[PDB]
Amino acid sequence: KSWVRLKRGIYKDDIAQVDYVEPSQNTISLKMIPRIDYDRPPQRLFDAEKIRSLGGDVASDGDFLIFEGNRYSRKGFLFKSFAMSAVITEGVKPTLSELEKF
RNA sequence: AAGCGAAACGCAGCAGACCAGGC
DNA sequence: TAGTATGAAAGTACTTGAGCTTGATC
DNA sequence: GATCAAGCTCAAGTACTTAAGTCTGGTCTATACTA
Ligand SMILES: [Mg+2]
């Protein structure tokens, strides 16, 4: 239940909460705040209803949702697997605002 | 002197080059 | 992909090596 | 009587600045990386 930051992609230098750690040592499940415009980027809370209304590449499974290139989001935050080497697990130290967000 | 129906409402800048021209 | 990252200037003032006076020595 | 050394004087460099006044108009201005 540590915190990491992605290296590539738009989520670069963004705090992510390690939700589940896969024993395979290949990818780890991470909770991010989506930096998306909803197919219409500052961090903002996920709007499943908004993305459903906008349509496009979207799959609705209640609280779970898949959109825009297999991007997964459980509840209102992206819940996606990311490579072990694509994130930094040492020297993150999130602030109180980050703790409140996650 | 006269006399009629007696609520709420005046923006904003790059900057820095280089050229031509003016007395 | 999607985004971060890589040939027609001249002047003075100051420092340097060469030559030379007076010294301390011989 | 002579010498070499210290150090003062001179002509050869180097380091550094400065180069009229104001005004108008016009164009033009990064993309490599490497994931
Ligand atoms: Mg004139």
Give the DSSP letter string of chain A.
Answer: --EEEBSSSTTBT-EEEEEEE-TTSSEEEEEE---------------HHHHHHH-SSEEEETTEEEETTTEEEETTEEEEEEESTTB--SS----HHHHHH-
Nearest Cα residue to A88 out of A30, A33, A10: A30
Q: Measured between alpha carbons, how far is A77 from A64 in angstroms, rounded to an integer?
A: 10
The set of residues, in sequence order, having a beta carbon less than 8 Å from that of A88 and lying 6+ positions away, is: A4, A5, A7
Q: Is A10 within 7 A of strand C by CB distance?
A: yes
Q: Which residue has the tokens 């738009």?
A: A10
Q: Is A9 within 7 A of strand C by CB distance?
A: yes
Rounded distance from Cα A74 to ligand 1 centre (Å): 80
Q: Measured between alpha carbons, how far is A82 from A26 in angstroms, rounded to an integer?
A: 8
Torsion, Cα of A79, A81, A82, A87 (10° steps): 60
CA distances to A4, A49, A74 from A32, in Å: 10, 18, 10
**What resolution does the deposited structure have, in angstroms?**
3.1
Tokens linked to A33: 């705040």
